[PDB]
Design a protein around this ligand. Structure first.
Ligand SMILES: Cc1nc2ccccc2c(-c2cc(F)c3c(c2C)CCCO3)c1[C@H](OC(C)(C)C)C(=O)O
Ligand SMILES: Cc1nc2ccccc2c(-c2cc(F)c3c(c2C)CCCO3)c1[C@H](OC(C)(C)C)C(=O)O
Lengths: 146, 146
């Protein structure tokens, strides 16, 4: 429910790494394909994310991915705190479910592009605008309510 | 004023290319440093932008940058129309002014990072949260008003 909360996790597909951020309260996704998991790439993703949306707290299923000096620098600069583990009723399985839907969609569109990263961005677009209201609409509502 | 309208322009700094998208009605920026101006890079930027915000129409000060097959494909897929030239009273000089502020800020923070792209993302963050209300707050309000 809390509106500044995002969960970041990486997945591998086709020998490449997909960084996925889910805005927990709405299910809205931002994702990028990165060459390999690196503190550098995560730091840079975080700086971009935080410049676009109000990021207060980051959750993850892999805490170690946020321990490098580059990533600490990013959270420090952007004023982001990282929760220890994951403390919640209403959001149970949301992030899991969103990551499950994103992958299903990537599968459906994969054939329409040469590059995995193109397919990822198509899937992100599809997911954010999907009317069950859309994640895209839900996140704006939450942030606007102020 | 119209809420689906973004202007995209490239600038060069340090022998590198900065792609800047300004949401005209609010002054909110998304920017990335790309290796060189290429249809490929623009197409990919557009696909990401449109997956995150409702992009109806793109304006530019360089129409030729939107003529490649890659970029046509992106606008076609995302349902984006491109205005011929630029038709407006209330937005006069906004995009010019926003690009002027972004560059001033890049200058102030450039020394705090090795990489230009890091400096760019710092400047984007600063610009979007700057309270005159912020661009970041204005864009959510506009999109939410529906
Ligand atoms: C190359 C680099 N190396 C670092 C080494 C140790 C600690 C931080 C950084 C950072 C870094 C990371 C950040 F997240 C960050 C800042 C720095 C210096 C300062 C402003 C706010 O956020 C960068 C950074 O490049 C990256 C590609 C890793 C972002 C740099 O360009 O200097
Ligand atoms: C490598 C590539 N080459 C192309 C050549 C001609 C026309 C389109 C593309 C596209 C493209 C561009 C798009 F914008 C796009 C689509 C394609 C195929 C299909 C879905 C919606 O948008 C890609 C694309 O890679 C880029 C890095 C340029 C995005 C690809 O991965 O195939």
């Amino acid at each position: 429910c809390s509106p500044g909360i995002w969960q970041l996790d990486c997945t591998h597909l086709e020998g490449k790494v997909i960084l996925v951020a889910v805005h927990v309260a709405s299910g809205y996704i931002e994702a990028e394909v990165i060459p390999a998991e690196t503190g550098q790439e995560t730091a840079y993703f975080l700086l971009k994310l935080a410049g676009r949306w109000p990021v207060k707290t980051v959750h993850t299923d892999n805490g170690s991915n946020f321990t490098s000096a580059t990533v600490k620098a990013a959270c420090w600069w952007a004023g982001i705190k990282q929760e220890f583990g994951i403390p919640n009723p209403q959001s149970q399985g949301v992030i899991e479910s969103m990551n499950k839907e994103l992958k299903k969609i990537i599968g459906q569109v994969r054939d329409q592009a040469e590059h995995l990263k193109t397919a990822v961005q198509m899937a992100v677009f599809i997911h954010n605008k999907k009317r069950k209201y859309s994640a895209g609409e839900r996140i704006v509502d939450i942030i606007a309510t102020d």
